[PDB]
Amino acid sequence: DHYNCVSSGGQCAYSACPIFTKIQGTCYRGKAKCCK
């Protein structure tokens, strides 16, 4: 979720994760990726 994603150092990204990050869970009621 958003709390875990960002508290762990990640980005909530709709659609896709930018280079040097990859999908690890979700944010925003499952509608975005958590990218770390």
GROMACS .gro file of N, CA and C in nm, residues 1 5 7 13 16 28-30 33 35-36:
model
   33
    1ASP      N    1   0.089  -0.120   0.000
    1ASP     CA    2   0.000   0.000   0.000
    1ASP      C    3   0.090   0.122   0.000
    5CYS      N    4   0.485   0.131   0.084
    5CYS     CA    5   0.565   0.162  -0.033
    5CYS      C    6   0.658   0.276  -0.003
    7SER      N    7   0.711   0.435   0.294
    7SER     CA    8   0.786   0.424   0.422
    7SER      C    9   0.908   0.336   0.402
   13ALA      N   10   0.344   0.454  -0.861
   13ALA     CA   11   0.343   0.492  -1.001
   13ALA      C   12   0.229   0.423  -1.069
   16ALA      N   13   0.350   0.206  -1.461
   16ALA     CA   14   0.480   0.143  -1.481
   16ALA      C   15   0.584   0.201  -1.388
   28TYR      N   16  -0.271   0.296  -0.360
   28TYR     CA   17  -0.392   0.365  -0.404
   28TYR      C   18  -0.500   0.266  -0.444
   29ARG      N   19  -0.540   0.187  -0.345
   29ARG     CA   20  -0.647   0.092  -0.360
   29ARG      C   21  -0.618   0.000  -0.476
   30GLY      N   22  -0.490  -0.039  -0.483
   30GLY     CA   23  -0.443  -0.134  -0.583
   30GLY      C   24  -0.428  -0.083  -0.725
   33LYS      N   25   0.118   0.090  -0.913
   33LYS     CA   26   0.228   0.004  -0.871
   33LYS      C   27   0.305   0.070  -0.760
   35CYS      N   28   0.689   0.092  -0.678
   35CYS     CA   29   0.814   0.073  -0.751
   35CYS      C   30   0.928   0.100  -0.660
   36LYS      N   31   1.017   0.002  -0.651
   36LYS     CA   32   1.131   0.016  -0.566
   36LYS      C   33   1.255  -0.041  -0.634
   0.00000   0.00000   0.00000
